[PDB]
């Protein structure tokens, strides 16, 4: 009835674009996170011992990138203002939206050419990628950036896309581990920011939550900036365990097993 | 129960032995929901090319068909079950590609220019999945020969390369080209449903694989012909969507809201 053969038999729906509204719900898929704030309050900073050369290489290269990025963004010294927080994450989530989508595509492409079951990996990686891009859609609202950032963002994609693509082919283990350790840093950053709100070292003006954040994370009009950070950090901690899991699975030759996290959205 | 205690765990490697293989988990939960006697009336459309690009897309699709019909010996012998399934195997390995690359490219845009996408990415992503679900379904009716596996692997290399540069140069062209591919998908499968009804093709695999049954939500008594019917409706959705998207590009509406987010 709603979507059926008369609509399926139409050449184009170009005529309808003017009369369809812009809703903030349609910006993501319907696979939204659903956290409970006083629970996720207790998300904590973890660190996973690296096994071999690959994990060490992933860890050192994450650590060398934090440092570079700390020092070129003048961030390490000055006061922790709301402007250097938004503006740092802003840049960081342009890059964070990439690894999920290269891995997903590539798993998709082998599923097709070897004609084999993927068993839940692709969509987990595809929603990681959207989730990070939803973080971007949200920070964008809190603070539009300048031309310098806009330029670095664009060149950075080219370097990162190209790197991650060859990395994923040569060694998905390395990329899942590399992400794993990125998310350790992302959780460190965000718990720091929530600590600073609490100790009064940062009082934010942007103490609304933009509509895109409000529907996506299902927050109430009364939600503080700190609440926004809290859900975001939870999201990041999820990705932390999921990719450390996926890297472990690779290390143990389980790249073709069932993705465990498909289950861990069930109430047993 | 997905809370701060599981979020605080290093790894779930230890659980992979005890998590069951479920046929529901092969896809997203964004599944099609057709009503069989409705979609029975899906029909065969053709969209006038607007300009040179649409024409060039149209000619590419038509030269591929000819090539692929002649080297697959489709004319030669009878319309068998073997030779239908075996051709759709090959075609869905290529059909899972365009939507993944288009979606990935729109994702990369949204990230680097920091702009709203307004619902395109996920439409194109599930198209890709949907076609890959067609493949997971047909793989069960018939594992292909070693020569077909080989030809599929070389094909993905050319097609993935081709679509990547084409989408970058001209997403209008790729959307139109897909648009016209799906016209053939609908021609083909209507033709198959016809043969079943006229008795020229008496199918053996009258047992819809479990992947297909739960993906499309069909009854246990559903027939191979029912399967073709939903599959052909899926293909028709994509026909109008990518012809829509191609038109949108032609009119410089690439950054408008994806009309099908409403028509959901
Ligand atoms: C391409 C430029 C290479 C410059 C060499 C410095 C590489 C990283 O530098 C090291 O990284 C750590 C990051 O956790 C810092 O905290 C250390 O203080 C620093 O020695
Ligand atoms: C790379 C090799 C290309 C060979 C070019 C010859 C094209 C074959 O002749 C053809 O006639 C068909 C009639 O059924 C038409 O449908 C096609 O448009 C056309 O390709
Ligand atoms: Fe992030
Ligand atoms: Fe992240
Ligand atoms: Fe198809
Ligand atoms: Fe198709
Ligand atoms: O992040
Ligand atoms: O097809």
Oligomeric grouping of the chains = homodimer
Question: Considering DSSP H and I runs of 4 or more, what fraction of the residues of chain A is helical?
Answer: 55-70%
Largest protein interface?
Answer: A-B, 89 and 88 residues
Tally of individual domains of chain A: 1
Strand percent estimate of chain A: under 5%
Task: State the CATH architecture of chain A.
Answer: Up-down Bundle
Structural class, from secondary structure content of chain A?
A: mainly alpha
The secondary-structure element order of chain A is: HHHHHHHHH
Shape of chain A: globular
In the CATH scheme, the class of chain A would be Mainly Alpha
What is the straight-line distance between the termini of chain A?
35 Å
Radius of gyration of chain A: 20 Å
The major sheet of chain A is characterized as: none
CATH topology of chain A: Ferritin
Number of strands of chain A: 0
CATH superfamily grouping of chain A: Alternative oxidase
Number of helices of chain A: 9
PDB class: oxidoreductase
Keywords: drug, african trypanosomes, oxidoreductase
Assembly: dimeric
Entry title: Crystal structure of ligand-free trypanosome alternative oxidase
């Amino acid at each position: 009835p709603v979507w059926g053969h008369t609509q399926l038999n139409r050449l184009s729906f170009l005529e309808t674009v003017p009369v369809v509204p812009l809703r903030v719900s349609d910006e993501s898929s319907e696979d939204r996170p659903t956290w409970s704030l006083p629970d996720i309050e207790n998300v904590a900073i973890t660190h996973k011992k690296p096994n071999g050369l690959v994990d060490t290489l992933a860890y050192r290269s994450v650590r060398t990138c934090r440092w570079l990025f700390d020092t070129f963004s003048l961030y390490r010294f000055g006061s922790i203002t709301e402007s250097k927080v938004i503006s740092r994450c802003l840049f960081l989530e342009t890059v964070a939206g990439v690894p999920g989508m290269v891995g997903g595509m590539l798993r998709h492409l082998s599923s097709l050419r070897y004609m084999t079951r993927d068993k839940g990996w692709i969509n987990t990686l595809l929603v990681e990628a959207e989730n990070e891009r939803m973080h971007l859609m949200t920070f964008i609202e809190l603070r539009q950036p300048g031309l310098p950032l806009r330029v670095s963002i664009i060149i950075t994609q080219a370097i990162m896309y190209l790197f991650l693509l060859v990395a994923y082919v040569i060694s998905p283990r390395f990329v899942h581990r590399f992400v794993g350790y990125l998310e350790e840093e992302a959780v460190i950053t965000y718990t720091g920011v929530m600590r600073a709100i609490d100790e009064g070292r940062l009082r934010p003006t942007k103490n609304d939550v933009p509509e895109v954040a409000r529907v996506y994370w299902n927050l109430s009009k009364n939600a503080t900036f700190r609440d926004l950070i809290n859900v975001i950090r939870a999201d990041e901690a999820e990705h932390r365990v999921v990719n450390h899991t996926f890297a472990d699975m690779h290390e143990k030759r389980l790249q073709n097993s069932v993705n465990p996290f498909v289950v861990l959205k069930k109430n047993p």
